[PDB]
Amino acid sequence: DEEIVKTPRKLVNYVPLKIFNLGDSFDDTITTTVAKLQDLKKEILDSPRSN
């Protein structure tokens, strides 16, 4: 193990952090714009096309 004993630690030493928990990779904002465009194009499909 490390050194001879357990490493010293602060009496609180919380440090929550954990902003991201796995996942990451694909961004959410780009696909959010994608989903907005999806509902927009569905609304367009509701509007008449051709004829």
Next chain:
Amino acid sequence: QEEVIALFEKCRNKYKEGQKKYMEIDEALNRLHNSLKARDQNYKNAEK
């Protein structure tokens, strides 16, 4: 997919503007046809 949906947006805008132009030109042509027939009758009467 974003490029294709933007392509459909521009396609539908061009489609709508083309139909607007087509209605404008057809309306103008029908009005001109009726006006030409009326003017032809008027000119024939005046000449006679």
